[PDB]
Design a protein around this ligand. Structure first.
Ligand code: CL
Ligand code: CL
Ligand code: CL
Ligand code: CL
Ligand code: CL
Ligand code: CL
Ligand code: CL
Ligand code: CL
Ligand code: NA
Ligand code: RU
Length: 129
């Protein structure tokens, strides 16, 4: 599924991401935009052999199992393919563990380089939330 901007905002809000660990909804939407372009099916191979999965580009090095990242962990206890679902529950649940892990949203390098410090509220502007 390719979400619309406000559609994804609503979904994230429903699943309790808005202000999770202090990060406002626009932060999450902005991260999704630059990680996946709002496409739940997005997959990208990393240099190290790990792969990033889904709307928030969650990495198999630590967070999900894909069977091909030696020798990574599966801290979200989920197959990586669950992260590509049209239903964002698994991605949101896993993202909550990630952002709680100590470096907050800096874990998402595209958030750090493209969202952090910017007018992230622009990303929920006009949404009926
Ligand atoms: Cl919704
Ligand atoms: Cl915001
Ligand atoms: Cl496997
Ligand atoms: Cl693996
Ligand atoms: Cl392994
Ligand atoms: Cl698995
Ligand atoms: Cl959803
Ligand atoms: Cl933080
Ligand atoms: Na893994
Ligand atoms: Ru839902």
């Amino acid at each position: 599924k390719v979400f619309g901007r406000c559609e994804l905002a609503a979904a994230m809000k429903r699943h309790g991401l808005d202000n999770y660990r202090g990060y406002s909804l626009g932060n999450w939407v902005c991260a999704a935009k630059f990680e996946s372009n709002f496409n739940t099916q997005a997959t990208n191979r990393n240099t190290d052999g790990s792969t990033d999965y889904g709307i928030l580009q969650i990495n198999s090095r630590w967070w999900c199992n894909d069977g091909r990242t030696p020798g990574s962990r599966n801290l979200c206890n989920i197959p990586c393919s669950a992260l590509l679902s049209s239903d964002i529950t698994a991605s949101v649940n896993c993202a909550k563990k990630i952002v709680s892990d100590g470096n907050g949203m800096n874990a998402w390098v595209a958030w750090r380089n493209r969202c952090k410090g910017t007018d992230v509220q622009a990303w929920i502007r006009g949404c009926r939330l």
